[PDB]
Amino acid sequence: APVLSKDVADIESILALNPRTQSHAALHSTLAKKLDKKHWKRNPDKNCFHCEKLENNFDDIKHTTLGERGALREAMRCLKCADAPCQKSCPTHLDIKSFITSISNKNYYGAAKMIFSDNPLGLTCGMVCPTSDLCVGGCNLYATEEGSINIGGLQQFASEVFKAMNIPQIRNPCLPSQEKMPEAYSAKIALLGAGPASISCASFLARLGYSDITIFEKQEYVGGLSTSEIPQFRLPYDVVNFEIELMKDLGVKIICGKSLSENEITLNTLKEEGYKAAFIGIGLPEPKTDDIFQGLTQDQGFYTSKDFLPLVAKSSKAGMCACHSPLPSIRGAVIVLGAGDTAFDCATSALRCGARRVFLVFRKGFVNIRAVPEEVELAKEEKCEFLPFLSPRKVIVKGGRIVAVQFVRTEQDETGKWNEDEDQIVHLKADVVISAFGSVLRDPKVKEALSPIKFNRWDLPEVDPETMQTSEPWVFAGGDIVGMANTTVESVNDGKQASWYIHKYIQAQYGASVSAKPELPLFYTPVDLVDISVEMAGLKFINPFGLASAAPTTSSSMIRRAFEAGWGFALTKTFSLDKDIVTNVSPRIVRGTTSGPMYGPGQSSFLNIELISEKTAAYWCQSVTELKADFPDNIVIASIMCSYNKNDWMELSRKAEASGADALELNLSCPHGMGLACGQDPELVRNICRWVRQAVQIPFFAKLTPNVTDIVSIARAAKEGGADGVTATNTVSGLMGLKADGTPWPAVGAGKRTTYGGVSGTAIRPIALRAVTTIARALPGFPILATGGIDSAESGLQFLHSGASVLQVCSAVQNQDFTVIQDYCTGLKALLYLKSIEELQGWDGQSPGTESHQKGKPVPRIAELMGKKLPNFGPYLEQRKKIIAEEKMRLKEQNERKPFIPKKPIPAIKDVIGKALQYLGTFGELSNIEQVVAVIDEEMCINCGKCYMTCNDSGYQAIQFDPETHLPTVTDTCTGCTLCLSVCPIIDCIRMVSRTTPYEPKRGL
Amino acid sequence: APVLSKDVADIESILALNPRTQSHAALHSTLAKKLDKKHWKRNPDKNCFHCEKLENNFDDIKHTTLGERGALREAMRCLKCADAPCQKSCPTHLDIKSFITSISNKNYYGAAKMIFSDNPLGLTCGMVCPTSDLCVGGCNLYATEEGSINIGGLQQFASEVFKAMNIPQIRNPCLPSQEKMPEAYSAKIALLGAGPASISCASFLARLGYSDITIFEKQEYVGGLSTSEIPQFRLPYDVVNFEIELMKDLGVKIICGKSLSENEITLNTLKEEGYKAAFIGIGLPEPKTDDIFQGLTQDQGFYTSKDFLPLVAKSSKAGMCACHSPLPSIRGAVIVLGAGDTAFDCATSALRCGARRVFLVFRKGFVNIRAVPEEVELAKEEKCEFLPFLSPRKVIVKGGRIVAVQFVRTEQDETGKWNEDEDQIVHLKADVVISAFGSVLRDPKVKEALSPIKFNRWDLPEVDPETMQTSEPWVFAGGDIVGMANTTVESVNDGKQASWYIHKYIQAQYGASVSAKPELPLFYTPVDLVDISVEMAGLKFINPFGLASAAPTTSSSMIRRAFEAGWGFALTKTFSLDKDIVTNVSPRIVRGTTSGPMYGPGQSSFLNIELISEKTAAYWCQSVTELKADFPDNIVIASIMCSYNKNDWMELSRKAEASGADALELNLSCPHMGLACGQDPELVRNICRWVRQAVQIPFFAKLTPNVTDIVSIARAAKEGGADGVTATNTVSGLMGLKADGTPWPAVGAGKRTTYGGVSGTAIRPIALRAVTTIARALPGFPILATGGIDSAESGLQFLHSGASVLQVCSAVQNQDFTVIQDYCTGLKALLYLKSIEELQGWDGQSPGTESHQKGKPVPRIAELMGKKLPNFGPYLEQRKKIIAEEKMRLKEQNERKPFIPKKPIPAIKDVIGKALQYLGTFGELSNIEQVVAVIDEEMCINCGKCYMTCNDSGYQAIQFDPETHLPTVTDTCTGCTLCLSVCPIIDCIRMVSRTTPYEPKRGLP
Ligand SMILES: Cc1cc2nc3c(=O)[nH]c(=O)nc-3n(C[C@H](O)[C@H](O)[C@H](O)COP(=O)(O)O)c2cc1C
């Protein structure tokens, strides 16, 4: 017979690339290394002077785009700062802390709601905001080596998921019915220009209740520059359409083919027609021109950005127009003049039109570029050449075509003045010239249509920077036309700012006043109407979330603020009779070491050696009376503890009941004598519950410790004793760790002493979930208040599904603050709402089904790629690029949005409780016939070989790892243990599927 | 009475910036936002065209430098890939996977050892390698949004900590005594030039045993370009000195003031003197010059990089030269000609000399820049202006000074071909001109000294790319002189490559052969001599680490490979008699959800529903016989399980003993106070009694943590005759449910599951408590620890807790068997460091945390400390001004010895149970020795997490400044320690003895 403990030839071969520590230094010549390097190349090659062909390629090129995997990582990284500087640096004042917290908790709906509440064009902005000069520029994490947070990408991700949910925006639920609205809200309102500014203004006015809002747009398309000029490869047109439809959900009307101009629409005609207010948001309609380009035509090869970009947009944005137009034929060398976003977008867009080479020419130096570094990077990575200190002087035309442009050198003198050197010239060959100096408002007919408002020095409408009001009280203006800023978000903010004062003005015209403090409404959807209340043990909870008896309930003043924030209920820190007064030691609460040396947000656990409340029973009882008086609908549960003494338990419970507590929670941590604690002995628990039951009439719950062999026996004892339910569970006994010198942490006093503490947080969730599930199955219907690692609506729902009715939280608040309640509530509403949407059954909660991707970007479904074994690196990547380019050329030759409606009642909390219990059982109830095997999606793989390493040293050596492509392949020896899927860095790259081939366990002999 | 549940004015004030969800959208004008943005600005302002003052400022400007906090985060992020592409892309073939794994496990020594084993200039390279064109360029994580790993920074960090340990390099321990070495090793060896190439070559030759190695250096200083030209602000001179001294530890001699030149040292004179081999590593000594600069002097303002950089280095690098030297007085506009590293370093260095403005002039375009993006970024961020397509023609000299440089425009045609346009000129004003075209070897005297070796077309020494041998068999060459590459790492590799063939050549000259397979020695230090063996229950373990009975021991072939890797011991997967045969289900092993949606490396836990081994007892017994036959020194423990039956346990135990197992481990998971035998003291006692009377070898009872009192079970096992206990098995739990209520793992069409066992770091607190409580209750009773052991550090925690050996499962599932190397070097280092008196302030391998920002030391300037100047907005501007003034003040103001153990290095037996002295009851903790939190404002990153945690989970004791976002702990602090626990910056907050009167908050008197 064979050497059983040895790998046969076949296995030794499959293990060829398995890591093995070397006993000697390696020997590889420098020449050999130079030759091997190209095979594994992932990033750009600095020695490569030409970037792949991009003709007709409008694929997303943003470096900030995130997929779910990446978004969760980045969201978890965010410090979720107080008085956040990023928010202060955001023109629309987005509550970044809150929306990123929501993303980290997988509550994409809540994140999107927060985003759109302050920015109606939340998705567009996430994609195009020059964050380095805005929110990200103020990020505290810039002070770390890893750097600032990708705020834009996170905003984009949450907004994209919300868009995919196809949920409509609704009228504010707290507004009176449309027919009960004061006459003033029917005032005819007009907005000129359907760009970011007007879309934002109209949206906020609609939120306030105005029912007659009309945006008059000159063109046949809507969205402004977001549609007509920003490239499809930066901002997909479907994003613009999505935001406009959300606005239309509020009743805003849009009429195209209508222009603000003499003989057409004017302020006078609007006033004559009965309009009560007007918002001017027409932007800067004309290109900034240069005399030297006079007379040049497109046929000769000359374009202004205003000519060029819309042509490319109309050809690349399906839905923009009804016309099916061809992409501008740009052949040869292209010269783009300018240093702002316009210039860089013209440069990159020129490449999509077939340009062989592109030159970005600046009048000043590289240091003076106006576009943010991130925008510049897109042109630079696509090999556009930059030529600084250049001023155009002449354009040479031959054979009806531009063939060159002559420039003069420019300089900065000992004064700060820019001069041109006539004797120093440049003759640059070029076939196409695109002027991208910027835009302005010149049309005399448009200016005349704005009579008689005052215009400033810059010949632009003058407005009060705070109210956005022009010299005419009923006319306001915002966006590019005001000339203060040139960003989508600032234009959106201008409309937002204007909406409040337009509201104030209109109300005043109808003899009504408005609050001195601005009150623009938030963003709402049907999800917000979802009822998340629940009844348990005769008590009505407005929502299932509450504060556990712990550090967050150290003082009643804290509970008050928690109720003000929206928490459904709260436990007082555990208190006792005066004779049981205690004194805490310090340090006493430490971070968990359960997930490695990761500091800051999201600690996976905490350990504490804290005692009961140091505050008296008198303080707590009076506090309870105060809290119940001010928050009658918020449930207050008094947590109490006594030694094993009947008179004490009856005295304290009665005192707590007399204070007005809705219920009591009995802390069974007091030692005695099965263990040392009362909560570890069924007999003691039964008696304690009996004493309390005969002492009070209100409901009471026994808080169980997980530190027992059979927690069900304790729960049963409590039930037999008269308890109305149980709280599962308290903290897990443990020792968090020791320093290298052997001393503990926490370390108390000069002696550096410690004692076993209680572990809390996500690290103990598996223990708490098992406890809740086992009790729910053994004692059906017996109320369970869950506690142990609840830190999101998703995790909360897991406990509800496991049999719990309400959810207590401690560690999640210690890791953050009381505002997480907003996230938990919107998150739970969303989870319940989605269960009624038939079209989204493939999603896992708020997570869309994972689509094949790389870096969060969808993988091209080209027949010429699937199954080609072409990883994203080295020569293989070059091949992929060639195939994609050919596909784009092939697509070139070859030349609606409805909201989902619930198709079933939205489940209430009571309808989901215990629903997961049906899947639990004994091991014997599990099928050993229905086996599975792992299957890898090569298109999502990042070639790390972790699946391979795990199967090799922790599995069945069933994966082949290719030595050239670093692509893994699961073979037929797979047993479906699932370890590979469990260690894979890419979500859903590996999936377990039903085994189709014969299965037979490996018996060795 | 007052309203107890309400915050008084004072507290309401302190809570002013505490987060509170808003009920309405915010209103802030665009103008207001523009004005407020500047206050919080962290990153560079794109509108700022003037670079900060950098005169005489040589502070580290590398973006890759990491501090411990940052290094740990990045190391944990690394996928630690199989057949890693980063290593393949590293010229010295560094085992990046392994050294980064060591860093993630806090084993900086092991990381440094791995680095230096393949690269003698590991620290220099970590700091200067153009990683984007090397290792990082092939990083698999480039395929994720977050991007590739900062490999260089990690290498730099580990190497810096090692440098701080001040541990010397030693001769290979396995080499024969110096006196027993064959005569061949005394062969006189000469190396020319003390740069990276020669330092590397000499180092490896010394490792091989050569005792007469001399490097002859022309200059008075050593280190080559690392010393003479690379800026101090990129590569501190102390780094070079450190690596030089490590080499000298091996006996290599360096003689300065000796040149390879016709009238001095020549190949002929060396041969005449008896030298047996010579390595030429003199680099490229002369600057590449241009005819137009002929005659220009430094006084006129002209320098070549070879003139300039050494001048700056000599004045900025303390220790480089004997006497002090002044910083070149560079005033006015500076023109730097070139596009490689040389040019960019000249540009940045010019600013340190006082340059007002710097222009980098390129003959080609920006796209053609030779330096990697990361090098270019340093000059660009310092506002250097770049002028492309420029070729110098004349240096206008008036009044004995350069006043300008006249250039001609350049361009590229059809076949690339570079032309110069004579009619297109530029007259650029400048006061200083620095040519940085590169370097060459031209000195006829030096070339003649190399007679008669063959030179190639490039007039450089010709060498075989594989052996580095010249036309003369006894002469080799490497580094810049060969002209193949221009990087420190490639030069180091050239010397490394040459060392093996020099060795082969010398041995052959003495009539000795060498292995066909290259065998360069690894890097060693005294730490490697540390004994980590331990004896337990009469068994001798070569090291305390072993594989737990689990997935990593699924097959005996795997245990074999584990022993080959170096694991001290291993458990077989639990096996039973034929009648108890089982069949596993699938899926059965899933990742933990204990630390959020973080995928890939370092899962914080796993859950499994796996059964005992599916392989027969016959297979395992034969396997044990085989394993013990081949690995007699590695301990093999047979894990067995039977139902509650005497005959069965006696039969199986005897069968396992007969196979040759060193010991047995009894799995007490079989259902027979719970449902398992391990949960009942009576059953455990009996089972152990049966086995005790059946076998003579030692046996250990594996305890389950799922019990009220684990000590009672351990005691039962001891009373039953067990020789020790294994604490502990997995924790019972449910890892989680999907949003639809289905579990994971989900088995079969019914998507069923059952309670599984949780393993990994998430259960370490439970296992640590178990080990410590058992160790305290049963002094001296052997304990084998299991539960979250994933590093030498964590292993030491268990040893300190009372365990003698350490079992591992999850850490291997997360990686592979090679972690054993990390654990062993890590434990050796931890024990070694305990003997170093000067490092007592360190926590294990972690140096005391110094005040820093982004890992860089905070300047200790009197006008900075206590100024309340955070690192953002106007405050940052002030800080920079203060620092610049300090640098000017410093301008106004014109040995490395190894630590020696001063106590015996502790053996494992000396550390076991040392932590027990600190554990006790809560009553044994002092409630009088209280502490309070103290924040180091210089380390703060202004997130406000301490503030939020104290507000909603504490005592509202922290003031958070509304302008500086700096926190201040007030006297109401109770020392609970939550703030310190949530702070993202390691050691920013520290707990200190309270000095002011302490009185517990009672709420009511
Ligand atoms: C997939 C898997 C299989 C296991 N199989 C066994 C087994 O057969 N016998 C046993 O005594 N313990 C078994 N264990 C438990 C381990 O030996 C070890 O006690 C546990 O995982 C705790 O250590 P860790 O934190 O290093 O993983 C298993 C654990 C896992 C994850």
Swiss-Prot record, chain A:
UniProt cross-references to PANTHER family, sorted A to Z: DIHYDROPYRIMIDINE DEHYDROGENASE [NADP(+)]
Family: Belongs to the dihydropyrimidine dehydrogenase family.
Top enzyme category: oxidoreductase
GO BP, sorted A to Z: beta-alanine biosynthetic process; thymidine catabolic process; thymine catabolic process; uracil catabolic process
Effect the entry attributes to changing C670A: Reduces catalytic activity by 99%
The name this protein goes by in its record: Dihydropyrimidine dehydrogenase [NADP(+)]
Major location category of this protein: cytoplasm
Binding positions (FMN): S549, K573, T574, K703, G761, T787, G788, G789, C810, S811
Propeptide regions on this chain: 1-2
Binding of [4Fe-4S] cluster 4, residues: C974, C977, C980, C984
GO cellular component, one term: cytoplasm
Ligand binding ([4Fe-4S] cluster 1): C78, C81, C86, C139
Sequence positions that bind NADP(+): 339-342, 363-364, 370, 436-438, 480-486
Pathway: Amino-acid biosynthesis; beta-alanine biosynthesis
Species the sequence originates in: Sus scrofa
Residues spanning the membrane: none
Binding residue positions for substrate: N608, N667, L668, S669, N730, T731
Cellular location(s): Cytoplasm
InterPro entries, sorted: 4Fe4S_Fe-S-bd (IPR017896), 4Fe4S_Fe_S_CS (IPR017900), Aldolase_TIM (IPR013785), Dihydroorotate_DH_cat (IPR005720), DPD_II (IPR028261), FAD/NAD-bd_sf (IPR036188), FAD/NAD-binding_dom (IPR023753), Helical_ferredxn (IPR009051)
Cofactor note text: Binds 2 FAD. Binds 2 FMN.
Impact reported for C125A: No effect on enzyme activity. Reduced iron content
Catalytic activity: 5,6-dihydrouracil + NADP(+) = uracil + NADPH + H(+); 5,6-dihydrothymine + NADP(+) = thymine + NADPH + H(+)
